[PDB]
Enzyme design. Sequence first.
Site, PDB file in Angstrom:
ATOM      1  N   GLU A 130     -16.264 -84.600 -24.343  1.00  0.00           N
ATOM      2  CA  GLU A 130     -17.522 -84.524 -25.061  1.00  0.00           C
ATOM      3  C   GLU A 130     -17.496 -84.468 -26.497  1.00  0.00           C
ATOM      4  OE1 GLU A 130     -20.080 -81.542 -25.703  1.00  0.00           O
ATOM      5  OE2 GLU A 130     -19.902 -82.918 -27.100  1.00  0.00           O
ATOM      6  N   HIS A 131     -16.697 -83.395 -26.983  1.00  0.00           N
ATOM      7  CA  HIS A 131     -16.710 -83.239 -28.423  1.00  0.00           C
ATOM      8  C   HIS A 131     -15.943 -84.311 -29.164  1.00  0.00           C
ATOM      9  CE1 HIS A 131     -17.207 -79.227 -30.175  1.00  0.00           C
ATOM     10  NE2 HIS A 131     -17.226 -78.725 -28.937  1.00  0.00           N
ATOM     11  N   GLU A 135     -16.092 -72.204 -31.814  1.00  0.00           N
ATOM     12  CA  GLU A 135     -17.359 -72.525 -31.030  1.00  0.00           C
ATOM     13  C   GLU A 135     -17.413 -71.435 -29.612  1.00  0.00           C
ATOM     14  OE1 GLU A 135     -20.775 -75.130 -31.135  1.00  0.00           O
ATOM     15  OE2 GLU A 135     -18.793 -75.344 -32.133  1.00  0.00           O
TER      16      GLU A 135
END
Lengths: 440, 54
Positions: free
Chosen positions: A59-60, A136
């Site tokens: 997804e990143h 993150e």
Amino acid sequence: ATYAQALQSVPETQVSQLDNGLRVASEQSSQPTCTVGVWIDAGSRYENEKNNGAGYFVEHLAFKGTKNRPGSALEKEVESMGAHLNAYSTREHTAYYIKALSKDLPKAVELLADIVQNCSLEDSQIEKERDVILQELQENDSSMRDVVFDYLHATAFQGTPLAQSVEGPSENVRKLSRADLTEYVSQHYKAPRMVLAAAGGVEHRQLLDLAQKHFSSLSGTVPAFTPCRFTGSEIRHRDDALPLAHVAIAVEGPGWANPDNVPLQVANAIIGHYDSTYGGGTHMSSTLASVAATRKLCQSFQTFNICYAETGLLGAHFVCDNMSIDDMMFFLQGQWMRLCTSATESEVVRGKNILRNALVSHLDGTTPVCEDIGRSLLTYGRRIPLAEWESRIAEVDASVVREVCSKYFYDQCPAVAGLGPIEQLPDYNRIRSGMFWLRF
Amino acid sequence: IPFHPYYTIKDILGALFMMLILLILVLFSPDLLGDPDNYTPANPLNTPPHIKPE
């Protein structure tokens, strides 16, 4: 327009199905904007121990360059026409939706076709993204809400894929290579597991033509998950340096199916939510919230309804100081068993109205409508019309709420996750004893 | 740990075991730890051959 007529006047969600298995669906409106996005059935629930975190990684990488669109060129498109490209990956769903103008749907769908099919997975880009994901993860470590919810998931579904977090362990993050990412996208981003939702001013036939012109060369016509097991446990990450103590207590709830969700939500609507910066304070109908405002027991509390495909978590999460965890556990369990044993009719009516407001007001704006479309065609298998929701809420009464709460709350082993100065937090035996009433 | 959910039942078990032992003594050998000479009227003109406390 007496409400019910307004509910009937809501336009319906037309649903189609491509030959590849793509469930193209659209809801037509008159707004000059739109939100179009694909929802895929990938997530951490379908991730093994070694693959854990591959969904977040892909997804990143999705937005950072494709094959046809090299790198920022893709982004160069999205900003050029004012589109807002966004994504989110839940434990069982993934989605990439592009807010755009109604006249930019032909291009936007194209971009989506590039994102999910012709991805890049550039090795150097993978290396740049690995440290970003690590930082993150470090940022999320300070998120005392997300950390507590992940603790609850781990301690409730221990030994099952549902216990896995979305981002995955840092070990997997550093270990993951390009081969794992491409294998994951090739195995999970299959056409039958994708739904191309599009809300706003998009005509369904135009959406169908666009999908057939772009999403045609997808997979033809397999991880189907395993029924996870609930295990009433507790995790106590005692850390007295933390200012507040986040606690989350849940029970095995229903799934996306099992209509008992509708009454159960009503029960949660009865308990409600509260925090320090609220309005009426010691006047709100929720006895829990009224007591909390009266004695300032906490700074926040909520009732969640996290429900997965076959199981789900139903319970509460409260943020309070170190000296008031026992009192709020007492009051929360007292409210739960008050609903369980004698729910009354007036509170049920209030819960029905609150649930009506939640469903109605939540579905405003193109983004929530499109998200509802994509999530409903995956979970329920059908976009449940608001009229059906109204009827299901109407069928709920005091006896139904009492019965369903007895089924899911009374004499059940809960899963507890506390983080912070949680020394006061009663031992699991005391909590389990609070899960049953001697008077009743 | 809180006293209630654990040590109440632990002391209940201990009390039951002590009751078992005490009831064994009472029902089966009531005068085990008792001098037989006590079962005799206290005569101040005659000492027991052996005098001992409990």
